[PDB]
Write a protein that binds this DNA or RNA. Sequence first.
RNA 1: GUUGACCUCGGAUCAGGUAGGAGGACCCGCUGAACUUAAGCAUAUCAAUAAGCGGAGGAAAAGAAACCAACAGGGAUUGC
RNA 2: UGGGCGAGGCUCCUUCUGAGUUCCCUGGAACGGGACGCCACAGAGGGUGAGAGCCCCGUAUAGUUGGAAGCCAAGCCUGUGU
RNA 3: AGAGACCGAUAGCGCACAAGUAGAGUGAUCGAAAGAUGAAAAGCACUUUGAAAAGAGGGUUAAAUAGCACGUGAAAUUGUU
RNA 4: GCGUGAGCCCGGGUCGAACGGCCUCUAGUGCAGAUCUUGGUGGUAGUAGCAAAUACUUCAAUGAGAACUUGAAGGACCGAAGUGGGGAAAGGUUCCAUGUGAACAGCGGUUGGACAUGGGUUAGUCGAUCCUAAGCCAUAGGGAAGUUCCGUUUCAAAGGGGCACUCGUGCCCCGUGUGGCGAAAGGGAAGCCGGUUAAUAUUCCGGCACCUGGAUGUGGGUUUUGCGCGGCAACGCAACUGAA
RNA 5: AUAGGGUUUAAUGGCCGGAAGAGCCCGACACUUCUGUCGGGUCCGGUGCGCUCUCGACGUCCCUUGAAAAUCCGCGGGAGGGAAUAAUUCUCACGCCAGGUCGUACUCAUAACCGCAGCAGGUCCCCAAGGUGAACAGCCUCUGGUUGAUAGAACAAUGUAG
RNA 6: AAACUUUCAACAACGGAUCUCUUGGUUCUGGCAUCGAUGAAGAACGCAGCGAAAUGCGAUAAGUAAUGUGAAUUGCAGAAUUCCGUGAAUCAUCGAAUCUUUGAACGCACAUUGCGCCCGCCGGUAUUCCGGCGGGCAUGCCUGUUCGAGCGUCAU
Lengths: 86, 122, 50, 52, 50
Amino acid sequence: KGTSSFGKRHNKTHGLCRRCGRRSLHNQKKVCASCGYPAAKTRKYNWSEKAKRRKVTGTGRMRYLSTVPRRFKNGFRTGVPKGARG
Amino acid sequence: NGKVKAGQLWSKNKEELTKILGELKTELSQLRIQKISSSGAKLNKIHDLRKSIARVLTVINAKQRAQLRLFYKNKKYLPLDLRPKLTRALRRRLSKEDASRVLEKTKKRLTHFPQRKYAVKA
Amino acid sequence: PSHKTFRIKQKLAKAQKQNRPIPQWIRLRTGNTIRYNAKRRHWRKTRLGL
Amino acid sequence: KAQIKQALKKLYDIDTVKINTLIRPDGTKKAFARLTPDVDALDIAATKLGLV
Amino acid sequence: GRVIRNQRKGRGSVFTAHTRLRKAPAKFRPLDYAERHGYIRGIVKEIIHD
RNA sequence: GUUGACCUCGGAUCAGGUAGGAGGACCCGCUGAACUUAAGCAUAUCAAUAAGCGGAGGAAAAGAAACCAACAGGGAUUGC
RNA sequence: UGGGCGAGGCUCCUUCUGAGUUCCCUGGAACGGGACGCCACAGAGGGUGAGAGCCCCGUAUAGUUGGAAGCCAAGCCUGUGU
RNA sequence: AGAGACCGAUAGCGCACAAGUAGAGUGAUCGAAAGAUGAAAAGCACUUUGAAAAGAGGGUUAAAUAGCACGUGAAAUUGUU
RNA sequence: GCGUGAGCCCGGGUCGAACGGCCUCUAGUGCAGAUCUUGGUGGUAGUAGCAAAUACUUCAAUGAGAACUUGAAGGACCGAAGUGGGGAAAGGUUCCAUGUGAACAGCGGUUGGACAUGGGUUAGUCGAUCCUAAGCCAUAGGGAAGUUCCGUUUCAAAGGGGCACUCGUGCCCCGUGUGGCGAAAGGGAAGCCGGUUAAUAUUCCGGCACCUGGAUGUGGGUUUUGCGCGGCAACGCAACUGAA
RNA sequence: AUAGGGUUUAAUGGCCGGAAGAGCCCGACACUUCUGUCGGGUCCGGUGCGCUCUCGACGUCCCUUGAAAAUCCGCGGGAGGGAAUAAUUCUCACGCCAGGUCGUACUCAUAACCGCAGCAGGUCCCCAAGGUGAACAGCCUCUGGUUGAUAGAACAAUGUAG
RNA sequence: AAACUUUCAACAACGGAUCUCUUGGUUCUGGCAUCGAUGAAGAACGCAGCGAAAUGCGAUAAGUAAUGUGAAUUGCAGAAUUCCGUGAAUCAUCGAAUCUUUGAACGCACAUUGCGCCCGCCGGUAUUCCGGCGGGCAUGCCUGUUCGAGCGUCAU
Ligand SMILES: [Mg+2]
Ligand SMILES: [Mg+2]
Ligand SMILES: [Mg+2]
Ligand SMILES: [Mg+2]
Ligand SMILES: [Mg+2]
Ligand SMILES: [Mg+2]
Ligand SMILES: [Mg+2]
Ligand SMILES: [Mg+2]
Ligand SMILES: [Mg+2]
Ligand SMILES: [Mg+2]
Ligand SMILES: [Mg+2]
Ligand SMILES: [Mg+2]
Ligand SMILES: [Mg+2]
Ligand SMILES: [Mg+2]
Ligand SMILES: [Mg+2]
Ligand SMILES: [Mg+2]
Ligand SMILES: [Mg+2]
Ligand SMILES: [Mg+2]
Ligand SMILES: [Mg+2]
Ligand SMILES: [Mg+2]
Ligand SMILES: [Mg+2]
Ligand SMILES: [Mg+2]
Ligand SMILES: [Mg+2]
Ligand SMILES: [Mg+2]
Ligand SMILES: [Mg+2]
Ligand SMILES: [Mg+2]
Ligand SMILES: [Mg+2]
Ligand SMILES: [Mg+2]
Ligand SMILES: [Mg+2]
Ligand SMILES: [Mg+2]
Ligand SMILES: [Mg+2]
Ligand SMILES: [Mg+2]
Ligand SMILES: [Mg+2]
Ligand SMILES: [Mg+2]
Ligand SMILES: [Mg+2]
Ligand SMILES: [Mg+2]
Ligand SMILES: [Mg+2]
Ligand SMILES: [Mg+2]
Ligand SMILES: [Mg+2]
Ligand SMILES: [Mg+2]
Ligand SMILES: [Mg+2]
Ligand SMILES: [Mg+2]
Ligand SMILES: [Mg+2]
Ligand SMILES: [Mg+2]
Ligand SMILES: [Mg+2]
Ligand SMILES: [Mg+2]
Ligand SMILES: [Mg+2]
Ligand SMILES: [Mg+2]
Ligand SMILES: [Mg+2]
Ligand SMILES: [Mg+2]
Ligand SMILES: [Mg+2]
Ligand SMILES: [Mg+2]
Ligand SMILES: [Mg+2]
Ligand SMILES: [Mg+2]
Ligand SMILES: [Mg+2]
Ligand SMILES: [Mg+2]
Ligand SMILES: [Mg+2]
Ligand SMILES: [Mg+2]
Ligand SMILES: [Mg+2]
Ligand SMILES: [Mg+2]
Ligand SMILES: [Mg+2]
Ligand SMILES: [Mg+2]
Ligand SMILES: [Mg+2]
Ligand SMILES: [Mg+2]
Ligand SMILES: [Mg+2]
Ligand SMILES: [Mg+2]
Ligand SMILES: [Mg+2]
Ligand SMILES: [Mg+2]
Ligand SMILES: [Mg+2]
Ligand SMILES: [Mg+2]
Ligand SMILES: [Mg+2]
Ligand SMILES: [Mg+2]
Ligand SMILES: [Mg+2]
Ligand SMILES: [Mg+2]
Ligand SMILES: [Mg+2]
Ligand SMILES: [Mg+2]
Ligand SMILES: [Mg+2]
Ligand SMILES: [Mg+2]
Ligand SMILES: [Mg+2]
Ligand SMILES: [Mg+2]
Ligand SMILES: [Mg+2]
Ligand SMILES: [Mg+2]
Ligand SMILES: [Mg+2]
Ligand SMILES: [Mg+2]
Ligand SMILES: [Mg+2]
Ligand SMILES: [Mg+2]
Ligand SMILES: [Mg+2]
Ligand SMILES: [Mg+2]
Ligand SMILES: [Mg+2]
Ligand SMILES: [Mg+2]
Ligand SMILES: [Mg+2]
Ligand SMILES: [Mg+2]
Ligand SMILES: [Mg+2]
Ligand SMILES: [Mg+2]
Ligand SMILES: [Mg+2]
Ligand SMILES: [Mg+2]
Ligand SMILES: [Mg+2]
Ligand SMILES: [Mg+2]
Ligand SMILES: [Mg+2]
Ligand SMILES: [Mg+2]
Ligand SMILES: [Mg+2]
Ligand SMILES: [Mg+2]
Ligand SMILES: [Mg+2]
Ligand SMILES: [Mg+2]
Ligand SMILES: [Mg+2]
Ligand SMILES: [Mg+2]
Ligand SMILES: [Zn+2]
C-alpha cells in the first residue's frame, strides 16, 4: 500500500454521462451516480439542500419558460396590430 | 452594393423572390473566396449580404404561411403548427358552452324565482 | 491514445480552443476591470476531467 | 465525400477523380480534390478568384 | 458475530457449478407410442468422457 | 347442408384523442426512527416529528347532520 | 314565465405641466459665505467638477391628446299560453 | 412592488467582482480568495547614461506626500542619520 | 493642562468631506490569555543542506555575459532479459518552424517538454463497424403501500417465403422457437515494392495486383442418343443443368 | 508384409515472368543558380548436437481430456426448365460500373501515465550481433544512443562504503 | 575609541488596520396565478469586421419581421444612414417566424456521430443494386371503423 500501489491505477470506473455531463457514469453498472440515468426520475434527495440548488430551475438558459411571464401579461393574444404591413 | 430594403420585398410574387435569393447567395460565397490576405470596406459587405438573405427568407416564409391559413379556413382539423398555442393546461379546460350548461329542473326555478332588485326604508 | 472516439475528439478541440490570452483592445474600453485570463489550463499543471 | 463531389460540379463545374478527407484538431474538415488529367488546375485557381 | 461459511453457499455467487465443458444432460427418450407398444433401435456413435 | 345473427376474446404504422418529466415554501395520504428527558433503565418521553414513497391547486382540504345537548332548547364547513 | 336595444359610469396603455444661473469674496471647479428677489395641492429622492425648492430628470393636483377589449346599468321598443 | 431605531467588505446570503466560478475527490459530494487613481487619462512628448529592466533631467495636475504594485496608510519586523 | 481613576481637553505634522456638546430612548456595547478564529511578521540563519546511477578536456563561432548553447578533434559509458528500434492502457498538442524582457527548469542559461505568433494527422485492402463467451437488460406473466423485485422460454393466438397484376390495394405454400447489448489480445472477404515533406504515410505520387456487391456482351463449351469425355484402379481436365 | 509400378494433401524449394528500367557501390566531366550529363560493376562454392521462427511424423501424463456463434463449401434426392437452326440457370477466359462513416500527429517513462513535483518507487508485450564459456552467467567490443543530474580549492576529528 | 546588542525621535521600507463611501445582502407589508409529446427543466457543440470568459442568439446564429420613439454607435476601423423620405441605435415594446445534437425522449441501439424497414421524387440501362433530397415507423388505455378466431351458442 502507498506509493508503490498507487502506480497500478490506469483504469476508469466512471465516464461521461449523456444527460448531466458529469463524469459519473459507472461503466460496468451503466447507471449514473448523479442524475440516476437511465431511470426516468432524476436523482434528488432532501438530506442535502446544497445539491438540490446546484441544478434547480433557473440555473440554465431557460429557453422557453423565460418568455412566458411577458405573454401572460398581454392575455395570450394572436394577430397583428391593426394596419401593419405584410 | 447595399442593403436589400424590406419595404419593397413585400410587393413581389414567389418566383421572383426565389430568384433574388439565388443571386444573393452567390457572391456571398464568392466574396468569401478572396477575403484571405486582404481586408477593407469589402468586410462590410459580408455583414451586409448575410442580413439581406435573412430578410427575404422571412418574407417567403411569411407569405406561404398566410396563404396556407386561408386554405384551412372552414375545416375541422388543421395541422399542429397552425393551431393556437396557449398553454397545455389552457388547452384542456372545458369550452364556454359546455361549462355553462344547466339541468332542466335548475332552469325552471331560475326562470320564475330569480334574484330580485329591492330596497328597505329606514 | 491514438484510438479515440468522436465525442472525446470533439471535447479536446474546445479545451484547446479556449486557451489563448485576451485581445489587447479589451483593456482600452471605458469602465473595464478585466486584467488577464483567469481560466488558463496547462497540460503540466491541471488535469481536465476527460 | 458523395455530397462534396456534387457541390463542386454544380458550383465550379469541375470534375474530380477522387477525394480524401480528414478532421483537423480544431474541429473542421479539410478535403483534397484531384482533377481529371485533361483539365488544368493551375489556371482554374487563377480564374476562379483563388489566390495564386 | 458474522454469517458463518455454510450459510453463504446458498446465495450462489462464488459457489456455483462450472458448466462450460458439459454438452448435454443424460436422460432417456420421452415416453412415446412406439416404445409403449413395440420397440425401436438406434446406433451408438461415440463413447465420450465429460 | 347452405346462409344470416348473437356472446366472449384478438390483429392492424386503421379514424380521432389522452397519460409520463420538472417543481414540491404552503396542501391530501402512506411509511417510520434514534440522539435526548426520566440525574441509571426496559413501559413512557422526544413524536403520531426528521429521512423514504405516491397524488394536486392558486389556494388545497373540509362541508349542507345517523350533530351538540338535557335547555324557556341550539342548527352545514373553516379561522381568531 | 319569453326576445332586442341602451344613455351614462368604472378598469389598462399613451400625449403634455411652477419659479434666478442677478451682483461681490474664497476656490482647480460654488452646489459654500454675504446682498437682493421669485415659485409652492410641488421643501420626496437622484444627477450635475463640494450641502441646489427656482441648471436637468422627477415630485403635487385634477384635467387634457389618442386608442383597444370586456364588464355594470338608468330607462325605452316589441311577442305571449298548445 | 413599497418600506426599516437592520449589516457596512474578517460584517451582511457560500457569492457587492467572468461564484456555485477556480481548485480537490474513482465517486456520492466538499468549495474559496478577490470592492475605492482623478472633476477630466490630461496614463509622462523630447534630451541624456545603460546590452535590457530601469535611472537622472524635463513635463501633465489644485496635489505625483495620487504613477495602473494607484484614496486615507496604524502595529509587529527592517534600513540610514 | 485638568481628574484619586476609567478617561477628557489643547499645540505641531500629515490628510481631504463630513462631525460633536447637553437631557431622555435603544443594544450584536469595552479583552492578554480559552494547545482560541482569519490574516501578517520575526529570532533560530545566510545556518541545515543542494554527496546513489564511473567523467570529463582543447580550439573556434554566437553573445552585454558561457562548466551545463552549436561545430570539429581527443577521452569514456550503456554492451542486445540496452540508456537501441516500434506498440497496448493512460495523457491531449507536449510534435515541426521562426522569435523572446520577467516568471518556471531548487547553480547559471544565448538553450528547453516554459513564453509569443504561424503550421501539421488524407485508406474499398491497417483497426472500429459484423458474430458469440462469462455476464447484463426489454417482452409474456407473478410479487410489492411504493421507489421497484423476480423472470430470458417460461401455464403467450409471439413468425417469413414466393408469384402475378396497366395500377399499391389480389392470390399461393411452409411453420417446434420466439429480442437486443457485451472482445482495438478470441472468431474474421481483400496490398506489396520504390520514391517523397521543416513536420504524415502498407493512405500521398509512380509501377504492378487483389476482394465483395451490382449489371451485361463477344470467344470457347454442350445438345438431333436432350444436361461432357478419359484411366483396371486411387483419380484426372479450362467449362460440363439441380428447387423443397 | 518385403519388392516392382502408379495417384494424391502439403512451398517460406528450383527455374521464368514482375525485374533492372529499380536500389546500392566506384570512376570521369561540368558550376551564381533554374541546373547536371555520361561511363563501368552488381559473381562462385562450403559447413553445423550453432541461434530464432515455422511445418510434419511419432511418444509421454490425467479420479484433470483441454469454448460457442456468424460465415463458406461438397454430397443424397429429382422439382422445374430447355435446341436443329438455333437455344443456353455453361461455378471457363476476357471486358463494363461502384465501394459510404469515425480513429491515424507525438511520448510510452531516472522529464510527456499514477504517486501534491521535471520523485532512486510502481506499470502489460514484439525484434535480439562478435569473443571467452556448459550458458539469455559475469567481464570487453561493433550497429544505434548518450556524455544529462550545482561547481572550484584543501585532505583534521567523527562517520557511510571498499 | 570603534564594531556588536538594546531604548526614543525624524525620513524611507514591509504590511493593509482605522476613518469616509456603496448599482449588494437581510427582515416585514402589499398585488398577481402563468411549465411540458404543439417536445419542459437540465446538458453538449457552435455563431461577432478584430473575443478567451460573462451576457445574448441558433446554419435566417452577438440576430430577422412588425409597432413606437426620432439621430446615433465608440476601444479602433469601416461604412451606414442624414429625416426629401427609402429611418441611426447592444434603444424601448413585442401579437408573425427561425430554432443544430440531445434530454420524460419515442424505428433498434450508443463506452459506436452504429445498424435497419416503409412510401414518394431526381440521377446511373434498374419494381429488386448504389448515391442525393423530402415525409414516416415507441409503450399503456378509451371511443368508433374494418378483417378474423371458437360445437360458447340461435334460427332454416
Ligand atoms: Mg490489477
Ligand atoms: Mg477499456
Ligand atoms: Mg429505451
Ligand atoms: Mg451548468
Ligand atoms: Mg480517414
Ligand atoms: Mg392511426
Ligand atoms: Mg396513442
Ligand atoms: Mg409526477
Ligand atoms: Mg434535540
Ligand atoms: Mg437517561
Ligand atoms: Mg444524564
Ligand atoms: Mg446511558
Ligand atoms: Mg405514542
Ligand atoms: Mg418528510
Ligand atoms: Mg382565498
Ligand atoms: Mg375543493
Ligand atoms: Mg339531508
Ligand atoms: Mg334540537
Ligand atoms: Mg355550526
Ligand atoms: Mg354606451
Ligand atoms: Mg419641469
Ligand atoms: Mg479667483
Ligand atoms: Mg452662495
Ligand atoms: Mg453632490
Ligand atoms: Mg438637488
Ligand atoms: Mg442660489
Ligand atoms: Mg470600514
Ligand atoms: Mg464576505
Ligand atoms: Mg481586505
Ligand atoms: Mg469592521
Ligand atoms: Mg463568505
Ligand atoms: Mg475532479
Ligand atoms: Mg484599496
Ligand atoms: Mg522619470
Ligand atoms: Mg542608447
Ligand atoms: Mg492632497
Ligand atoms: Mg509634478
Ligand atoms: Mg492622494
Ligand atoms: Mg504596497
Ligand atoms: Mg496609498
Ligand atoms: Mg515601527
Ligand atoms: Mg473626494
Ligand atoms: Mg459580543
Ligand atoms: Mg487580541
Ligand atoms: Mg483574564
Ligand atoms: Mg496563524
Ligand atoms: Mg516561520
Ligand atoms: Mg552549508
Ligand atoms: Mg543531487
Ligand atoms: Mg545527502
Ligand atoms: Mg558537491
Ligand atoms: Mg554520480
Ligand atoms: Mg542578446
Ligand atoms: Mg564577440
Ligand atoms: Mg557536466
Ligand atoms: Mg559496467
Ligand atoms: Mg563497456
Ligand atoms: Mg526474449
Ligand atoms: Mg523513438
Ligand atoms: Mg529557438
Ligand atoms: Mg535556477
Ligand atoms: Mg537567472
Ligand atoms: Mg532565457
Ligand atoms: Mg521540441
Ligand atoms: Mg505553450
Ligand atoms: Mg477503385
Ligand atoms: Mg481487415
Ligand atoms: Mg460497417
Ligand atoms: Mg445480429
Ligand atoms: Mg430485470
Ligand atoms: Mg405485472
Ligand atoms: Mg455486438
Ligand atoms: Mg482479433
Ligand atoms: Mg492506391
Ligand atoms: Mg498508386
Ligand atoms: Mg465480379
Ligand atoms: Mg457460341
Ligand atoms: Mg447435386
Ligand atoms: Mg511400395
Ligand atoms: Mg528474372
Ligand atoms: Mg543499374
Ligand atoms: Mg549505372
Ligand atoms: Mg558460441
Ligand atoms: Mg520466443
Ligand atoms: Mg505515428
Ligand atoms: Mg519501450
Ligand atoms: Mg521513474
Ligand atoms: Mg504527474
Ligand atoms: Mg554471446
Ligand atoms: Mg565455444
Ligand atoms: Mg552473455
Ligand atoms: Mg533516446
Ligand atoms: Mg566538490
Ligand atoms: Mg577522513
Ligand atoms: Mg569500515
Ligand atoms: Mg525606559
Ligand atoms: Mg512611514
Ligand atoms: Mg427543440
Ligand atoms: Mg416518431
Ligand atoms: Mg409520435
Ligand atoms: Mg465498444
Ligand atoms: Mg429510375
Ligand atoms: Mg434508395
Ligand atoms: Mg429520413
Ligand atoms: Mg375490433
Ligand atoms: Mg364464427
Ligand atoms: Zn448523469
